[PDB]
Amino acid sequence: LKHERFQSLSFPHTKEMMKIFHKKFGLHNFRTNQLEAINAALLGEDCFILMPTGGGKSLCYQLPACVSPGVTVVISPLRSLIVDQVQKLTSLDIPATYLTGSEATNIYLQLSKKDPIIKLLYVTPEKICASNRLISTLENLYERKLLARFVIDEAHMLRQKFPSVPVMALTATANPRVQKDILTQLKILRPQVFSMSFNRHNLKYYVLPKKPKKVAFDCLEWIRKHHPYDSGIIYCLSRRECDTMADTLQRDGLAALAYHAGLSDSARDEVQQKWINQDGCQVICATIAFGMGIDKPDVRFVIHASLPKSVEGYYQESGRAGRDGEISHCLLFYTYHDVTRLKRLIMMEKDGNHHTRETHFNNLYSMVHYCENITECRRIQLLAYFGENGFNPDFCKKHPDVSCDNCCKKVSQREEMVKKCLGELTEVCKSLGKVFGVHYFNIFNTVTLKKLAESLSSDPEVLLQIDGVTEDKLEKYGAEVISVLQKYSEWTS
Ligand SMILES: Nc1ncnc2c1ncn2[C@@H]1O[C@H](COP(=O)(O)OP(=O)(O)O)[C@@H](O)[C@H]1O
Ligand SMILES: [Ca+2]
Ligand SMILES: [Ca+2]
Ligand SMILES: [Mg+2]
Ligand SMILES: [Mg+2]
Ligand SMILES: [Zn+2]
């Protein structure tokens, strides 16, 4: 009943909320739970949002941040999230900045002005639990009624100084024990809880037989056939496996780079920037901690070249594929020889007891159960592991384009022009990204670029009807994008 009122478009804030949604974000339709969480936030409620990767958590706090006077402070332990969101917001001409760790002094000075201007201020938990200058800046905003909200983006002491400021916590963790632990911490606030299925609608799950001395050649062949020009990740069990996987792909002309703790800080920074920008690196061959630290929205494939340690690890590692919502593939190469490799690592782990080993073995038991279960829908298997009941077993049958492997068991001239145009528009976004200091997908994302190419239009009134196209973006990037589209005028209709 409280949640049905959160579906209303008749609040005092609705007109401004919808104006900013359409004109500043360039959007047209809300996704599951977005309108409800946004309305609860603008009504002053504390919120807890449980939403999988790709669901659209960012808009849940960024759109209320734009509507409200003053500053929304966003706490996040993920540096990749902070950099991505500040680039995204800056590209949209939404004032935003971060404090993670002289440049801080300029931010504190701007926040103290009559008009702080900054709408979203991103900070790390370490920065907000140590910087006394940040605390007094927040005190100054609070006294002028310009401290709008505290957000924790990926929620996996401060309420005493600012008790009237609402809190919004968001998480993509499917672990129900972690979800309940976060809710326990927020319980005194009596937050509105918005939950939904953790099913990743756009991911295709596969489990393939692994040849222990030939998996690199199978990766190379699959990538050339399905995603020759798209980014991907190959997760490996060890640093040496990363290096041999990258070596093998490099010897065959595929731009692959190993990404792990063995690299120097200089080499890590170079591999990260080449892969994020599609600049001389198509695939990163990574250990789990390293692959989970980079936030690219258009990862078209995640391949697990060896067995993951747990289903929770598998879901969260494969799950970062396709944050843009476009179809992506999640291939797990399975051999029981990798179970033995993992058991040896478990037995040799330093400071390990029968309990830590038992925990690791129990995690391995469930991962192998998924690999050996060749009948039940893989979407159902993943959600059953996390205790999510009520998932439609017919999902893969209803959407065969994203069917898991267990449920599985012509080009026109105008479309050729659409593909050529899309290629030129992506190249334009890469050159614009260098000029504006953002990654190409923060000039225009995958879906916006795909729809711009499909239109083949150079009319701003048509282009402004596409999701993600905004008047502020056409003022900054429009001459370049429209110059490309103009060349396709014979094919528009
Ligand atoms: N209502 C919407 N309509 C269209 N695109 C949207 C909408 N909400 C979010 N998006 C886009 O979907 C993508 C994924 O959103 P994001 O906030 O990164 O998801 P999450 O943080 O939940 O993984 C982004 O490119 C974002 O701009
Ligand atoms: Ca958004
Ligand atoms: Ca289920
Ligand atoms: Mg996010
Ligand atoms: Mg409350
Ligand atoms: Zn299925």
Residue numbers in the entry: 639 to 739, 744 to 798, 816 to 1068, 1207 to 1290
Please share excerpts from the published article on this structure.
RECQ helicases catalyse the unwinding of duplex DNA with 3’ to 5’ directionality, driven by energy liberated by ATP-hydrolysis. RECQ-helicases are strongly implicated in the maintenance of genomic integrity, principally through their participation in the homologous recombination (HR) pathway for repair of DNA double-strand breaks and restart of collapsed or blocked replication forks, but also have roles in toleration of microsatellite instability and sister chromatid decatenation. Loss of function of WRN underlies the complex progeria Werner Syndrome; defects in BLM underlie Bloom Syndrome, which is characterised by growth retardation and immunodeficiency; and defects in RECQ4 are associated with Rothmund-Thompson syndrome, which displays growth retardation, skeletal abnormalities and premature ageing. We created the expression construct BLM-HDΔWHD to remove the conformationally flexible Winged Helix domain (WH) that requires the presence of either a stabilising nanobody, or interaction with a large DNA substrate to facilitate crystallogenesis replacing it with a short poly-(glycine/serine) linker that serves to connect the Zinc-binding domain (Zinc) directly to the Helicase and RNAse C-terminal domain (HRDC).
In our high-resolution structure of BLM-HDΔWHD, the ARL is disordered and is not visible in electron-density maps. In their paper describing the crystal structure of BLM in complex with DNA, Newman et al. observe that the HRDC domain packs against a shallow cleft formed between the D1 and D2 domains of the helicase core, with the interface between the different modules being highly polar in nature. In our high-resolution crystal structure of BLM-HDΔWHD, we observe the same ‘parked’ interaction for the HRDC, even in the absence of the WHD, but in our liganded structure we see that the HRDC domain swings across the face of the core helicase fold to make a series of polar interactions with the ssDNA-15mer, which is presented on the surface of the D1 domain of a second protomer within the asymmetric unit.
